[model samples]
Target: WVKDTNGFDILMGQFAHNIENIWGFKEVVIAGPKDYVKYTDQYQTRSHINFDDGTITIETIAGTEPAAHLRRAIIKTLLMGDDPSSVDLYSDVDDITISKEPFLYGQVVDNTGQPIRWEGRASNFADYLLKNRLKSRSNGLRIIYSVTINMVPNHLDKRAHKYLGMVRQASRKYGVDESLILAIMQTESSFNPYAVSRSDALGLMQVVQHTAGKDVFRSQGKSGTPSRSFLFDPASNIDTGTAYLAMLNNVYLGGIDNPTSRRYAVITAYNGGAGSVLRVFSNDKIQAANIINTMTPGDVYQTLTTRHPSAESRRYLYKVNTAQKSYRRR
Candidate 1:
């Protein structure tokens, strides 16, 4: 469904970034003429899979020999599901050993109505190519194909499963609720480990290195800013995010009496600062704490949702609160 080459290049760049850093959900691998970073304005060959639906799409633009490119992209995409850690798209195709049945065996169809057959192993595909070569050259023309590999099960469990252990560990270490941490992770990045926000927030919890990341490190008796690599790692990102949440609850907003009210304040403060949460009630911290303590939990929730300066933070509190319910223990 790619409209043009520019869109294709941008999509491929994002895919390459995800492949290099993240582990679950969508898996993308590209085999091309040169290093992915060095792809020209008019590059050829790309492939992607949406693990949730098991849909795969592949394309080649103005390729001198497109069949080989298509074969390579398909093989690598399948191998990704089998053993992602071992799937190297840049390696020699012949060197790759294929395991698992080719459930996508004869489903892919070319533009000319011919199906590309897969007989399990890489060597067999090479032999098949020798006997059934594509007659027309794809030079100066675009060729694309897509298929649904139904045998490749939906990966929603894989998405959340990969991060639960780390989230639980961080929650226990920080005294933050595991459901709250899971909710924040789902809200921030939808469990995409390589996600980066427009404002330069990084990883699963989207901790901006200079702000939350720095605070987390300082709270641990360390000084410097956290590196991008550190935040990109799911374990460290969850630990840092949970620690910051604990800080908001135990230190900044600790004067508030109601646990429910304080939890609401912490949720808002996670997005907007603790000062901003107080500013919703009063300019003075002591006065704000006194005001919040007097109000009921429902009243505090209404005030934050209605009076918070940032529209994003106001919505963020509701989203996190709602999402937390799903993760709660039955």
Candidate 2:
């Protein structure tokens, strides 16, 4: 199963806005590519080959002016791809062209090196850059982690299927590919089920039992703050969590129509309370809306930041992507 760690919206918000700038401006303008394919490392399949005859190695964005910003870009790119086998030095930044691809349909980056964008750009080349780098020298990251999970037969693919099964058997029942489930799980837990945090979330799903006996563990008689002990029980923990996710899916996402958006809502609820999630996206639609400028990715992390969430939990999503280079090896 994948790790449903949390904070995807915040991170994607950063990427959606800063991608053109944070990563690079579009130099090649490709057409006829599918729009449904979200940005991920799989874009490599849509990859253009490097002739090696190209001019100069593009310097890593981090190696440019703002070191922190470029460093964060490196991390996000790794996570987006989920596989780092293709990772090369900044040598090939200038070698790209969107000639003909069926899956990836994004513009090459622009020349000006703009900040970020939430809406569509007028030119084929999208330009967005980063000025702020969240991590200081003292911090380390776990950008991506491989998790082993118990899954029923013929479920989802092996990537993060255990976590995927827990997110929604309905989506599974409806034949939603496990890839999206793993993606959501990666956003939620980064594949750690017994992972408990100070905020009192537990299990692979990171279900919270803050109010003692609120809707959680009525059968188990859990009252007061939930702990790491309860989370180790995978079955019961997933039972509580997956059920909660179904509830969230119905409440915020208007029911399975766009599971991607639904994923955003459920993850927000998992990290923030369902109520806070309800309030945040109720009239606002998506919590990620109008919030990208907030962080390098985009969304309110104060939603996660508290004594309950250490800098690790609060900034976990970003770091998950940041340190992902190590995991692609596995």
Candidate 3:
């Protein structure tokens, strides 16, 4: 659900994504509205769907994304705010299920999507679980659009643009696209330096201080009050984040300009980790094939949710991509 501020609403997972101690699940699928709220104080709007048959769709309240209700449930399980990309912490068996809540009951099916379809006979506005019950049997899941929602644009014209300029300059100097820098900012912190990922990613690019960008951003300061202090500085955050993106572009994809799969490579490196990209590829297309930055946002999102590296990661990607659509719908 969305936790709103005058400026923006944070999209948090239905269950806070706060569980660091989850394990043994081959695949985790989190299907919800595009405007699904996440903990970083970001929000998403719903997109397209094939719910004509009332199969799969996101649930909402008053025709808008439900933000608050989802928030409380999610926070209880979010334990990975320290390093969102690391899988080593995800063990074969861990204690990370949020089953202790007295308010929650064991329904025959998941109640996330809502309208709960009961007896397999319900209207478009079915009961909670039925409406939310994901129709895996139904193929060709299309992009579903819901109500448009947007964070308060960073109209801090002077300050926001000042940082935008910094991002562009640094991005260009570092051989990164200015748009990519912006996309990263949007994906990471929605341009809010104070924004912090549940995985402890702080600042514009959601740079996970020690868990990931440790040695890479060490020069800027990676620890203690000093390093932590830089999380809110636009210049500092973009400086570190852009540099890391460039490094991923170059080292992982063989220099930023190479026709080889650079865009997805860089992003996969950025999101999952350098090696995760390598691991995710098949026949090395991931290595030799290229991903165009020009692919529509829809295509980019489809790739992640369709593949969803892991259970937790799958839900994570879904939440973000969903949010992207929410903004688009608006």
Candidate 4:
């Protein structure tokens, strides 16, 4: 039962460390009889390692295991050879080589005529095993387990490079941090230039169509009210979104003078709306200013989490900050 919290916790830790499988029963470095008693609701509590010639085997108590556990074990087998005591086991997944292990997942191309490939992480497991030359040598080991998960299309990972030039150009022009822009882009629409949210937030930065047409675009000195549809264009979208974020930081939260507050408050305002932030500070710019002027950036984050008016605003604040950590100015 990898879904069980304690089991999943152990399972993720083991995967993070790339430990393929455990050996024997809990009592012996490896065990045989009486180990059955150590079973949890669905899995064994301990393991033992064995080998034959070059192949490795890890024996654990039998029962159903989750696909997450099996997939991590398979990845652990290929990405980091199973050696329980090795210091090198904790290497990150980002370190995996693509050349030797290409079929990590399938094409899942956009084909409306055909059935959507719907290849989820489980599909990733099966495809990876079948495509690779390595035959699973459970001749030694075994483990016991995405339903239409509307994934974000992972465009940030696959397509972010396409806009790096524009992102960099905009950052230079606006004096905004490229990483912060990228983080906004990542959280909004994941760099999917054509993406449209249910609320009509469009393009890479998820600018609401009306907001861009009526306010964001015009504020940037556009004489013509650009149609909301124009946001589908990557260049136009980046221009509007970045300029809008800049305005939010400078205008709505002007009382909070710390440059850092500008960046973070703008991010908050981006998702929850500038009005929401104003409301949190009692909608009095002078009061908000007076309060934030004395607070540290850490204190600002604490206020965002604890004092924000709405749960959604608090969550958005957290997610945008988390996204920022991945794409810092480096």
Which one wins on lDDT? 1
TM-score of 2: 0.32
Lowest-sum lDDT 10-residue window in model 4: 30-39
lDDT tens digits, residue span 2-22, model 4: 133366346446542322234
Q: What ranking of all candidate models by TM-score puts the best one first?
A: 1, 4, 3, 2
CA lDDT, candidate 1, residue 10: 66
**TM values, all candidates:** 0.63, 0.32, 0.42, 0.53
- In the range 1-330, model 2's lDDT, one tens digit per residue, is 113223533443343444443343442211111101122231211122111111111123233333333333332321232211122211223222222221111212223432113223312121222222122221132121111111222211332444444545534543433343344345544453324343445445556654422454543365543443554455555555554555556554453244444444445555555555445433454544333223332233344333223353445434433333333343
Query: Better model by lDDT, 1 or 3?
Result: 1
lDDT of 4 at 24: 27
Residue 313 lDDT in candidate 4: 72
Q: Model 1 lDDT vs. the true structure?
A: 0.63
Least accurate stretch of 10 residues (summed lDDT) in model 1?
32-41
* Candidates in descending lDDT order: 1, 4, 3, 2
- Provide the RMSD of all predictions against the true structure, rounded to 1 decimal: 10.2, 19.4, 16.0, 16.8
TM-score of 4: 0.53
- How far does residue 259 in candidate 1 sit from its true spot (Å)? 1.6
lDDT on C-alpha atoms for all candidate structures: 0.63, 0.35, 0.42, 0.52
Over 4 Å off in model 3, which ranges? Answer: 1-162, 218-226, 255-260, 282-305, 311-330
- The alpha-carbon lDDT assigned to residue 315 of candidate 4 equals 85
